[PDB]
Symmetry: none
Subunit: 151 residues, 2 copies
Amino acid sequence: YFFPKLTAVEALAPYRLRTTWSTGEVLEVDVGDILRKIPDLAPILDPEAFARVHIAEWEGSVEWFDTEFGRDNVYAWAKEQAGEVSHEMFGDWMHRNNLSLTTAAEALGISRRMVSYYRTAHKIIPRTIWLACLGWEATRPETKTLPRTLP
Amino acid sequence: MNEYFFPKLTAVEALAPYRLRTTWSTGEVLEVDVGDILRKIPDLAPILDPEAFARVHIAEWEGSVEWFDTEFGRDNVYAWAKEQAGEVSHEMFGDWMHRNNLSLTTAAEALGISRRMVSYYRTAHKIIPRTIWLACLGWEATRPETKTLPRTLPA
C-alpha cells in the first residue's frame, strides 16, 4: 500500500504539475518525459488537454482521460525530482535483495514498523537510511560483525 | 482514440487564388490549393472573391485557417498540403487504421513496426515513407489471419 492521499492537482506550464497531499506536502513534478515516452499518452501533450488534469474519483489517481498515473508513482517522481529518496527506491532495494519486512529490519538495524513506514511512504526516508541501504549492499554477505572498511 | 496533431500552424499567406503558403513548427513551408474545397461548400462561396480570399489568417485562439469563421482545421490543411505534393498524409494513415478498426497495438503488429512509430505517423510527428503506405495497402489486400504472409495477392 501507499499512505499519502492526493488532495489537489493543478497543471502548471507544460508539463509540470503541482500536487498537494494529505501529509500537508505540496510537491511539484515534471511529467513531460513520461508523456513523450508512452505513445498512448500523446493526446495529453496538447497544452489544452494537459491543462485538463484532475484527480480521478475511484482510484485517487492523476487523470486527464482515464487514470493515467497512480498517485504512488506520481509521489515517488516528485520526491526523486526533488533530490530525495522515494518509497519506490526503498521498495526496489527490498525486492532486489529479496527482503521481507523482518529481514529488511535486521539488515538496517531498525524496527519492522519503520521499514513498513518507509516502504509505504508513511514516513519520509532520511538520507541516513538510504546510505545504510547502500552500505548494507556494499558489505554482503553477512559476516559475524560489520567491517571496519569497504571490501 | 483521442487525437493529437503534432505540427503547429505558425503562418498562413494567401498567394494567387486559390493557393496558400503555410508555415509550421516543424520548419516546413508548404503550399496548398483550397479552390476545389471552397467551390464544393456553398457556405464558403464569399471566400471565392479574390479580395475576400486575400484576408486569410490564423483564427484567434482556435488556430484554424480562417477568412470569416474557422473554415479549415489546421490538421486537415496540413494533410491536403501533403496529399497535393503526392506524399502520404497522417489522415490517409489514420483512415487506414479507422476503416480496419486498428489500435496502436494491432497497427504495429499489422505493419511490423513499433507502436511508437505508428503513433508518430498517426499524429504527423514523423513524415510517412512511401514504403509504409504501400505496406498499409498490402496488409489490407491480404489481411493475414496468421502471422505468415502469402507469396501473392488473393484472386
